[PDB]
Design a protein around this ligand. Sequence first.
Ligand SMILES: Oc1ccnc2cc(Cl)ccc12
Ligand code: NI
Ligand code: NI
Length: 330
Amino acid sequence: AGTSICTSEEWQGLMQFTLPVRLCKEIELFHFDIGPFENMWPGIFVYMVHRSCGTSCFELEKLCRFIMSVKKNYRRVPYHNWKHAVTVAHCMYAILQNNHTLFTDLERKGLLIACLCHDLDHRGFSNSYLQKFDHPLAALYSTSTMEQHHFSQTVSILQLEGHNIFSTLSSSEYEQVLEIIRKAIIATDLALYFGNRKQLEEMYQTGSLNLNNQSHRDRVIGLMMTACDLCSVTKLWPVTKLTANDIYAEFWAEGDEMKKLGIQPIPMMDRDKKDEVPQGQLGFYNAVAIPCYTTLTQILPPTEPLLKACRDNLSQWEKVIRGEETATWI
Ligand SMILES: Oc1ccnc2cc(Cl)ccc12
Ligand code: NI
Ligand code: NI
């Protein structure tokens, strides 16, 4: 109820924060895992905005208020949380650094913010659930239901007193950036990923892909947003495996709610069907993640380590299925 606002203590603290030097080099890398550094997550986002866009891109006060309010409008859910937001934002930063001049300064600042904001106010329920049980949000947003809500939450935060990091933009650039952000957040709807990937694959294979074509650009950005959203599948196996637990904590809790309403959940959301998880991950990697990173690598060659990592993780799930797991902690 309402949009939440960071305290003065919170945003002034972030202003005064400094990143330990050792980390600077690590953050550049695709495989970097933010996990061990919880206190530093907001500062890591600052550092990334500053290195990619410049320290003069945003007024520092408005930026710190914005980031800290963004954090306060993530809910305490097992997966679609503040930690996930920064993880996604970090993947984008690594894509952007490796492909810097392909994207405009407006696209870079827009995309880093869109990633941080792309799951705002997520409740732990999927679009399938909201549409099945006619949540009011599905009345408002007939397709891409939660994504449309996340964009609306983003705009609400920008509109808070002293939070509009985009106010210094020309009126024309302001409309362009909100449109960059809307499209990017919408593209995180995996329902849309399937057609987009198939289109991009066709454009690439026939050689029609042209990055000077706004419709093509929009699509490449969309695939980038898919790759960033799913990037937990591109970490080192222990990291990826641990994250998988949080994803399923969330799925199972939704499954439980379905059962109360007289509907048996899909196996993926059934806590009594945990034996089927490894095969379901295999299916997810084969249907979604592998193709995503495969096509992204063809379009943006420097993103190849995301694909190589994802391939290594598919192999690990295959190992689990063959009974070849070694010891695991969670
Ligand atoms: O198996 C999965 C289903 C839905 N979303 C997922 C997201 C990640 Cl990062 C990994 C596996 C997923
Ligand atoms: Ni989402
Ligand atoms: Ni997400």
